[PDB]
Design an enzyme around this catalytic site. Structure first.
Site, mmCIF file in Angstrom:
data_model
loop_
_atom_site.group_PDB
_atom_site.id
_atom_site.type_symbol
_atom_site.label_atom_id
_atom_site.label_comp_id
_atom_site.label_asym_id
_atom_site.label_seq_id
_atom_site.Cartn_x
_atom_site.Cartn_y
_atom_site.Cartn_z
ATOM 1 N N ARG A 64 -69.385 -20.882 91.681
ATOM 2 C CA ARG A 64 -67.890 -21.203 91.706
ATOM 3 C C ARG A 64 -68.225 -22.204 92.073
ATOM 4 N NH1 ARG A 64 -71.056 -17.044 95.341
ATOM 5 N NH2 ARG A 64 -69.918 -15.454 96.252
ATOM 6 N N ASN A 105 -63.174 -22.533 95.699
ATOM 7 C CA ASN A 105 -64.681 -22.549 95.771
ATOM 8 C C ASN A 105 -64.730 -23.918 95.084
ATOM 9 O OD1 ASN A 105 -65.944 -20.382 97.056
ATOM 10 N ND2 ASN A 105 -65.306 -18.593 95.550
ATOM 11 N N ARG A 161 -68.303 -7.165 103.804
ATOM 12 C CA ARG A 161 -69.010 -5.905 102.685
ATOM 13 C C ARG A 161 -70.281 -5.378 103.122
ATOM 14 N NH1 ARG A 161 -67.608 -11.173 98.536
ATOM 15 N NH2 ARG A 161 -66.085 -9.718 96.906
ATOM 16 N N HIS A 186 -70.847 -20.491 101.571
ATOM 17 C CA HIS A 186 -70.210 -18.735 100.403
ATOM 18 C C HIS A 186 -71.283 -18.830 99.767
ATOM 19 C CE1 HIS A 186 -68.019 -15.955 99.281
ATOM 20 N NE2 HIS A 186 -66.960 -16.426 98.622
HETATM 21 N N1 LIG Z 1 -64.754 -16.265 99.698
HETATM 22 C C1 LIG Z 1 -63.753 -16.968 99.655
HETATM 23 O O1 LIG Z 1 -63.477 -18.007 99.234
HETATM 24 C C2 LIG Z 1 -63.035 -16.539 97.248
HETATM 25 C C3 LIG Z 1 -62.435 -17.810 96.789
HETATM 26 N N2 LIG Z 1 -62.019 -17.648 96.212
HETATM 27 C C4 LIG Z 1 -61.202 -18.502 95.268
HETATM 28 O O2 LIG Z 1 -60.240 -18.506 95.647
HETATM 29 C C5 LIG Z 1 -59.249 -19.255 94.326
HETATM 30 C C6 LIG Z 1 -58.375 -19.140 93.419
HETATM 31 O O3 LIG Z 1 -58.773 -17.959 92.918
HETATM 32 P P1 LIG Z 1 -56.829 -16.537 92.097
HETATM 33 O O4 LIG Z 1 -56.350 -16.779 93.484
HETATM 34 O O5 LIG Z 1 -58.235 -15.735 92.032
HETATM 35 O O6 LIG Z 1 -56.768 -18.030 91.269
HETATM 36 P P2 LIG Z 1 -55.961 -17.853 90.581
HETATM 37 O O7 LIG Z 1 -56.352 -18.418 89.204
HETATM 38 O O8 LIG Z 1 -54.861 -16.653 90.236
HETATM 39 O O9 LIG Z 1 -54.747 -18.793 91.628
HETATM 40 C C7 LIG Z 1 -54.727 -20.598 91.538
HETATM 41 C C8 LIG Z 1 -53.693 -20.696 91.555
HETATM 42 O O10 LIG Z 1 -53.457 -22.057 92.077
HETATM 43 C C9 LIG Z 1 -52.668 -22.487 91.005
HETATM 44 N N3 LIG Z 1 -52.914 -24.411 91.222
HETATM 45 C C10 LIG Z 1 -53.319 -25.202 90.271
HETATM 46 N N4 LIG Z 1 -53.294 -26.068 90.659
HETATM 47 C C11 LIG Z 1 -52.563 -26.337 91.657
HETATM 48 C C12 LIG Z 1 -51.519 -27.005 92.685
HETATM 49 N N5 LIG Z 1 -51.516 -28.601 92.352
HETATM 50 N N6 LIG Z 1 -51.228 -26.928 93.743
HETATM 51 C C13 LIG Z 1 -50.555 -25.368 93.698
HETATM 52 N N7 LIG Z 1 -51.028 -24.509 92.873
HETATM 53 C C14 LIG Z 1 -52.007 -24.552 92.033
HETATM 54 C C15 LIG Z 1 -52.552 -22.397 89.294
HETATM 55 O O11 LIG Z 1 -51.512 -22.319 88.235
HETATM 56 C C16 LIG Z 1 -52.811 -20.168 89.617
HETATM 57 O O12 LIG Z 1 -52.152 -19.714 89.450
HETATM 58 C C17 LIG Z 1 -60.674 -19.651 93.592
HETATM 59 O O13 LIG Z 1 -61.095 -20.753 93.998
HETATM 60 C C18 LIG Z 1 -61.771 -18.305 93.981
HETATM 61 O O14 LIG Z 1 -62.439 -18.781 93.065
HETATM 62 C C19 LIG Z 1 -62.132 -15.942 95.437
HETATM 63 C C20 LIG Z 1 -62.943 -14.871 96.041
HETATM 64 C C21 LIG Z 1 -63.226 -15.476 97.082
#
Ligand SMILES: NC(=O)C1=CN([C@@H]2O[C@H](COP(=O)(O)OP(=O)(O)OC[C@H]3O[C@@H](n4cnc5c(N)ncnc54)[C@H](O)[C@@H]3O)[C@@H](O)[C@H]2O)C=CC1
Ligand SMILES: OC[C@H]1O[C@H](O)[C@H](O)[C@@H](O)[C@@H]1O
Ligand SMILES: OC[C@H]1O[C@H](O)[C@H](O)[C@@H](O)[C@@H]1O
Lengths: 331, 321
Positions: free
Chosen positions: A95, A127, A158, A182
């Site tokens: 992460r 993250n 979970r 996390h």
């Molecule tokens: N417990 C938790 O907090 C969890 C956190 N995550 C995290 O959530 C985050 C997102 O995961 P996903 O949606 O699967 O990733 P994803 O890659 O599908 O979506 C991320 C999006 O952010 C966009 N992006 C990049 N720069 C940007 C900006 N300045 N403004 C707006 N959008 C922008 C990208 O174009 C992309 O579409 C990741 O960092 C992941 O590790 C994932 C699972 C659980």
């Protein structure tokens, strides 16, 4: 300004990838409010928004989802949920492999919030959760009680699912908490698991669950995220993370005062000094309305210090990056 | 096998549409789910995520992931999204027909009493392949497309008139494609003909014609905006609402691709038509009193079905085997 003015809440999703789309879907289905899917990828959020406006019609409501590539779409947002970031390194799990990149994205987002919706309630997901939420806060300058990170609700869900499957009881009646970072040092609080308030120990003594099951679930909880990454092949979990964040936003919007383990700014509590950590808190119409301080025993305090150290270790990496210590010129 | 009192819903295909429908089953507490796919591991990852999601919303709905058709055992509903997809790519249809016949064979063996909904186009070709290999009654299988197209038509009328989509009735019949027929004459606002709103100046014929075209262009507009893939939220929800109508004997009306034996001048083919879905599957097929212009337009879809059947037979009979 994309939000046409009306009574409904205005929910701004900064990031329109896997989790952002999931959350927009939930808003349509729940009639929670109008939504803007904001992203930096051109036109992609407009495609998802069009699909989701159709979805609203499928289920007979007029929730509107908008797509935008402009930060000014945050104007008049009541809630902002952040999933923005670069999530894969070109050419090719942790992460944290993209912290230097995503810290800068968090600061652009924070500045956008400061400019267009400084009074919104902010939930971060990106993250590494506990230091990214701080980066947003500092750049946005929002009150400490108006921003948090989603993680504990997912980690706790979970833990709760596994106890529920073991005992053959509904997850509705399994109370369970994972506090701390996390990350690898997350702390499933096995001592605080209850079945409708009945200590899990009572079920251990009755032979309904044994100490081996308990230990395996403790480990499997910490491993669940990586387990999903491995099975998916690409990306990470997005259904349970999106629903967790949306329930937190719903608690703010409807003043439910539900309890969520969330990454909250602490100064004193849990031996934490001016940074964020996953702790039980109450979310209502005034934001983070209460931070609950568990009466942890000595062993649990020891384990939790592992989480606190992981966060502090990340703060120093960020200090070094910002200080220019980790790069140099050709010369 | 993977599957108690709860309905069991088998999702043949674990892509974005499949996951969307599994997500809906968890949220709605509709039934336990299995995500089947030929890719290893991936359906188990999504299922794990969705099992956690159930607990997030305080219920015990279970999603399983499987790579074995034996997971269809005791399924009450099967929703099929499998297939390979991309000028004309009819060369991919023989392999998809092969896939459909594998699924139908599994249905015959593991869940012959299931209600079956197919989403993979061309629906007349692919629905028939499943039906023939599964040997299920014709009233227990259909295709999903009309509900999606109709929901798009309804949304645009609703946005124009500033009324809830709940109160816009609209239908798009025929073949899902460039010859789909939005029935602009049958649009009503709580039963009030759209013509009354035209005459009153609340919507004009230029608006109507534009919406007729936008309904046909909607799926491609989404593809163009997304960059990657195609729509899956409204398609997934459309299919699940059809499945729910069967599971709860709701008798709701959906434009679905149903086996016709003379309705609309079609025999022995599937076509998107209004029907009633209840506990006994396709319980009623409604035959609209289409006028002359409308039957002429509908003929484009009927000719497309018949032309496609001929082309498929040509490809098969040209195989050196
Ligand atoms: N417990 C938790 O907090 C969890 C956190 N995550 C995290 O959530 C985050 C997102 O995961 P996903 O949606 O699967 O990733 P994803 O890659 O599908 O979506 C991320 C999006 O952010 C966009 N992006 C990049 N720069 C940007 C900006 N300045 N403004 C707006 N959008 C922008 C990208 O174009 C992309 O579409 C990741 O960092 C992941 O590790 C994932 C699972 C659980
Ligand atoms: O999982 C095995 C043990 O690990 C940790 O030390 C927890 O404090 C304890 O409750 C748990 O049972
Ligand atoms: O259904 C017949 C339709 O033909 C054309 O598409 C017209 O634009 C539309 O207004 C008319 O209703």
């Amino acid at each position: 300004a994309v939000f046409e003015q009306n009574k409904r809440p205005k929910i701004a999703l900064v990031g329109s990838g896997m989790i952002g789309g999931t959350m927009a879907f939930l808003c349509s289905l729940k009639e929670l409010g109008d939504v803007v899917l904001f992203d930096v990828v051109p036109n992609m959020p407009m495609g998802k928004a069009m699909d989701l406006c159709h979805n609203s019609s499928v289920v007979d409501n007029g929730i509107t989802v908008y797509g935008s590539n402009s930060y000014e779409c945050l104007t008049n947002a009541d809630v902002v949920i952040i999933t923005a970031g670069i999530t894969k390194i070109p050419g090719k799990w942790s992460r944290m492999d993209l912290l230097p990149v995503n810290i800068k994205i968090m600061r652009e987002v924070g500045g956008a919030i400061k400019k267009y919706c400084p009074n919104a309630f902010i939930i971060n997901i990106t993250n590494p959760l506990d230091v990214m939420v701080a980066a947003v806060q500092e750049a946005a300058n929002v009150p400490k009680h108006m921003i948090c990170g989603m993680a504990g609700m997912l980690d706790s869900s979970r833990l709760r699912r596994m106890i529920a499957d073991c005992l053959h009881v509904s997850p509705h009646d399994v109370q369970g908490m994972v506090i701390g970072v996390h990350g690898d040092n997350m702390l499933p609080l096995m001592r605080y698991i209850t079945i409708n308030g009945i200590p899990i120990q009572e079920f251990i003594n009755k032979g309904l669950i044994n100490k081996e099951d308990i230990n395996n679930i403790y480990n499997k909880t910490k491993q669940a995220g990586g387990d999903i990454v491995r099975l998916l092949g690409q990306g990470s979990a997005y259904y349970a993370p999106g629903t967790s964040a949306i329930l937190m936003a719903e608690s703010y919007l409807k003043d439910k005062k539900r309890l969520f383990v969330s990454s909250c700014y602490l100064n004193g509590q849990y031996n934490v000094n001016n940074h964020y950590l996953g702790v039980p808190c109450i979310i209502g119409g005034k934001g983070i309305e209460q931070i609950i301080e568990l009466d942890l025993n000595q062993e649990e305090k020891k384990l939790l210090q592992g989480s606190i150290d992981e966060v502090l270790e990340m703060q120093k990496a960020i200090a070094a990056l910002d200080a220019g210590k980790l790069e140099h010129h050709h010369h």
